[PDB]
């Protein structure tokens, strides 16, 4: 029975109507694990995020209606947690555990608009003791990782090159780009610039590659980001 992992920047959940439509969308997608970014919930308001079928919901949130991340696990998934690491500022959350007795390490990250790849590299640094051979890093990196991740096809800046080098040192690869080397799909559109970019990513341990059956982008009506879904064997 295959595990599916979904990542979606939801662009805010402080409204009830949004929360109801996220719930219907998640229940239609039926993911085993769902990573959400920019819930915009404060540390006070986390119990507003509830969805039938996904009772286990881990969340990292700051004090303001900014950022905010969450990892939802399906009630149908036999999940045993071992470690949950929450960003005090609500920009990332790591959940470690086992499903069907396989260990999985999931880092859900929401990088800020400014200095995104530096922030990510620092997070990898802060969390290096918990990175392993079954690590998935997904979320809104707010940065392309390679030239084909932007409609402009411009080269990635120096900060991004260092992040990629840090990823390589940790034996981490862009799973989406590995499965789709020539892909020209995008997850975000910036109207000021008429620019399209893939700033949402699924990065993982190289040892997980053989378990990565399919990965695809899912456009939607809920948010200004498209989702990414990964199917594990
Ligand atoms: Mg946003």
Residue numbers in the entry: 6 to 238
Extract from the study:
The autonomous non-LTR retrotransposon long interspersed nuclear element-1 (LINE-1 or L1) is one the most abundant mobile elements in the human genome, comprising 17–20% of its content. ORF1p acts as a nucleic acid chaperone that binds L1 RNA, while ORF2p provides endonuclease (EN), reverse transcriptase (RT) and RNA-binding activities through three distinct functional domains.
In addition to the four water molecules coordinated by Mg2+, there were other water molecules near the active site. The one with the strongest electron density is coordinated by Asp145 (2.6 Å) and Asn147 (2.7 Å). Notably, Asp145 and corresponding aspartic acids in DNase I and APE1 were proposed to activate nucleophilic water during catalysis.
